[PDB]
Symmetry: D3
Subunit: 151 residues, 6 copies
Amino acid sequence: MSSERTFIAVKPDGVQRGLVGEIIARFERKGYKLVALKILQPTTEQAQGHYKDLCSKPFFPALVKYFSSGPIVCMVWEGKNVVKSGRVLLGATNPADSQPGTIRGDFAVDVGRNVCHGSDSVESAEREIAFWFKADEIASWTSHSVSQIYE
Amino acid sequence: SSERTFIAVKPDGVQRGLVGEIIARFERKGYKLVALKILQPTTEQAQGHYKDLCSKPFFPALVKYFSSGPIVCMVWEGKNVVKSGRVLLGATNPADSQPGTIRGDFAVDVGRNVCHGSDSVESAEREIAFWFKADEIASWTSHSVSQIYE
Amino acid sequence: MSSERTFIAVKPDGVQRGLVGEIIARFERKGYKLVALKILQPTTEQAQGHYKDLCSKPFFPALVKYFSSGPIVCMVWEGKNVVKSGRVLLGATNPADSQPGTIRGDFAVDVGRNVCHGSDSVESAEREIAFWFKADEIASWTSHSVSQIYE
Amino acid sequence: MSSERTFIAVKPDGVQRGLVGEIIARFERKGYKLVALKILQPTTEQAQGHYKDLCSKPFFPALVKYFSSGPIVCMVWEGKNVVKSGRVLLGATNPADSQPGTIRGDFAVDVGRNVCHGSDSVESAEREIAFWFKADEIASWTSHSVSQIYE
Amino acid sequence: SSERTFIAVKPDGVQRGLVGEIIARFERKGYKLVALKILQPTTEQAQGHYKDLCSKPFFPALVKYFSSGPIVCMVWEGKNVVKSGRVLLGATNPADSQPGTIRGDFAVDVGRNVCHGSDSVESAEREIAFWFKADEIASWTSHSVSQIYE
Amino acid sequence: MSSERTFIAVKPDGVQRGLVGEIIARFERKGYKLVALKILQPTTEQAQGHYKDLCSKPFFPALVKYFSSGPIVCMVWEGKNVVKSGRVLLGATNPADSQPGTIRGDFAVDVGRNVCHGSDSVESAEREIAFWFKADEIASWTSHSVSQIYE
């Protein structure tokens, strides 16, 4: 259960608006363990592969273009319930519905500029992590605080 | 889109040093400040502000309180700003407000609930005209508009 | 009533993780008045007395061992609706249900590591205050801001 | 004197970068009293009048063009030693010399993008206040906290 | 190493809601809280606290003020905590304090300078004994000790 | 001048103590542009190479062991004066001498646990960047805020 991992990505607008550190700090304060991190501008092919499930949609080309338009920050977080906690920390995908206190609630207005992405399930997270990161990019370490955060 | 809302920091919010906190939360959200001022409402401005309540109990006490010290008046511009503004402020009654909102974090009593935000586009347009002349509203474009808005 | 009081404790994990000041600051910002404050490591007996309503539960021995494992910070806060508002500020007791913006929503993952405790009712608060503090440990004072926070 | 006043402006870059609330909050936290506040885009003439002491400098035309390029937030703050303390809060006027903890130290890099302005003396403050505000725009009020901030 | 310092939030710092802010800055720095209490000093405690000033002007006024409302007393433990504590609080006279410190961020007047910290190990040991019994000081080990201290 | 880059590394203690996001946010707020980022546990050989200049010192083996004991976060920041501004943001290398408002001033006590490293000069920064990052790891992008931050 505490081996669970989620994928979080700061989208190009989140990077442009200087929100990378804020997002990372919110996960660290929550007690989650950072195990992979990188910044990169997705290529068209990376953006297409990430949005594979949407490749039949009319807005797919626009999405792909936007997602590959500048750098994103890719992250993997580890810990008990991290997939669900990650979605709760980010807030509702549509910022009009997000609560203050969450990342979208505090910072975002439009669904197309919603700052960050997080995995929607453990199964999606496994796919996302392996898509963006090679095995040798994932750090294996133990937090000195683990017995303070987890039963 | 060019939707605007009116936000006031009430006399207790000014007295408690909350003006900057409230402005910062709107800026962080990506909204655009287009008008700003501090003043102590006259009796007449307070009666005008509360005109809808003139037949409700304790109207003179409300008028006296709202005119007792300075308020800060603001106008914010952006997509869904009226609804988002109310969400940012939190429930009008602080006992029902959620932590993370202004009333959720800073208020306890409805009578001292720190701030006011317009409840609809129609009310916003009325409140903005009531408190500001046209020439006090700034026309400008945020350099971040394409990062915030689709 | 303006003179309502509640008991809040930062549990041993909250003290270990350096959350004491953060918790106190959130109650001060809300407009509540601090009237009692101390740090101590509960004895087994004090922990059992604290959790006496749970004495028939299978998780009682673990709760007691953990609560007596290290220092807690005990507090009493005063003001209108402080019991209910205290609980709201701390967030759902199981952090999996807690909302960001609350202490458990921002900082906690596991229910046995839920950082803090707040009385669950006025009746419970009266019991907990009397359990942890003598009458002469409670400060009687008037906040200069009282007429700005309360009508 | 407790009634000393200073002029602070958030410059067009500070407004663009969403620093207005942050600046106001730092003056409120310090214990100073806000007595005047407005947002406007300076005309060329207002910018030249503001920088009139610099009218012989080669960088004057650039300073004027920049100051009149977009909205500023004008403020007057009141309290003991507010002119000097204002300058200290904003930090060294050249951000390369500013210390972290100050507005320019935390937020600015370039001197032509130094986020804000504060009067450099009581004489300058009196001039700047009169330049930007009519007497009837200045609020006279008493902070409930005055006896907690001043002896 | 096991060096300890005494920090008090003075009556103005408690009245202005600064207790949590001050505690948080010591926690963040990596220091260990070992004693904590709130009380309104009696006349006698205030005279004891200011004993070194009993022959200086306006001593009775200082005594009256320090005994006028609650203070928060704390003891912090760690390497260089006496010196680091004073640096964290900032210059005693707020006009000389730097932004980033407690007095730099929150105080204006030396007479209302929010907090007090021991100026030496010898003074700390005296102040700690004055305000706390031995059994009020907690003995514990921070789980983070090896991350903070060489 | 605005092409200047510096290398910043959160040391193992900074990562263990949950300070990665805080550090990143302080650079973002200052107006600097993040262009490379990664988390990894240095190998012994990486730690030895990073500390090459110290390889003759008696404390070198201890330093190498500590630096390779857990993950660090490597970063490159870009912008005018970033090397000097980075050192100013971090504070004095010895935390006993660091000012509140800086990273060491706020968070660190001991020189051996001083949270973060930053390049001491433009020449050192070039070496550090190339040591830790390949050319294809450095993102080339333009901040939408560049004309707000820089003259």
